[PDB]
């Protein structure tokens, strides 16, 4: 490899593993539209297996830019619009508070406060429907943002249902293909299981347990050579064959909302670039990231920003990743680590790579 990414890519993860105890990690770095990988430590402390580049990782709500862009993609099918009623795709939700919630407030967290979470104790079907049926909102439709699970991952659910495909299939078909993510799933098959990393939380090895509209929120699990893929499939959507997933992609880093200094897409949040690294650190943070704050429409939505920093954290029980990159810079990182370990560390040290090498 270059000598100047061998250099910070070291110098910056280093530390950050030995500060955050994390057992496993691999890191892609995209210079150039090219790709470069790094792995240090264990997959399976237990076994002694390495991570490796084949080595899938528990993406959690990374996931979200899959959905995204899979909405993005039924969007330029013709088959939904953002503009339709929830209740246009779900007609058995016929309670009051749902007039006037669109997909875009499902897709974009502006609902009116749909939680966080989706209730453990919703299983069935019927639950679901009882769950959002029995929600009240805090705010009007479009006035507030509040990162939810329950808000995209019924998004994703819903914009798959013109195409009568499940969620998992349409994934698959659209996405994973076209893109050649031949080792990035919803559910690890049997003869993948010898790759898959444990998560460690508080020293015990785990997975991340089912749970409703899990597929769509936090579900995927990837390799770090995957999801270097998937960056630079995000970096130049334009080389993309297939017309309407190149569509999707452009329609996932649209602007649509405004909070503070950062745009919120579809799955994707957007910064203009050269952003402030304090903005980016302080504001990936729980305590920010997580918050109700009022928005601001876009109207119309901005087509995607070239020179802008586009990115995303997820983390499960026992993982923690991190993606982000520049168009206009075809500069780019993916951070995948076996714990789950604070938002403001993988966007520091994304930032002290991206920063050198730009
Ligand atoms: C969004 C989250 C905080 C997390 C994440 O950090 O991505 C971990 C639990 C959670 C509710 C979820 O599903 O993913």
Redesign the pocket.
Known sequence: APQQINDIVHRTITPLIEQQKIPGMAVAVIYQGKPYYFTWGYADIAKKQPVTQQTLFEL??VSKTFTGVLGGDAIARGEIKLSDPTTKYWPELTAKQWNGITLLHLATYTAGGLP??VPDEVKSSSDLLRFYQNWQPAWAPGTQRL?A?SSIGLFGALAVKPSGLSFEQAMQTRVFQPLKLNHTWINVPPAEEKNYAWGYREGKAVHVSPGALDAE??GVKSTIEDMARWVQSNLKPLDINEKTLQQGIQLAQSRYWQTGDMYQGLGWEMLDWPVNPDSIINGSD?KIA?AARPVKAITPPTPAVRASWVHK????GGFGSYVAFIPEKELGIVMLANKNYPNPARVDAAWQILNALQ
Request: charged content about 0%; glycine content about 14%; proline content about 0%.
């Open positions: 959690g709500s966080l979470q990162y699970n929120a936090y729980n997580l954290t997820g983390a499960t």
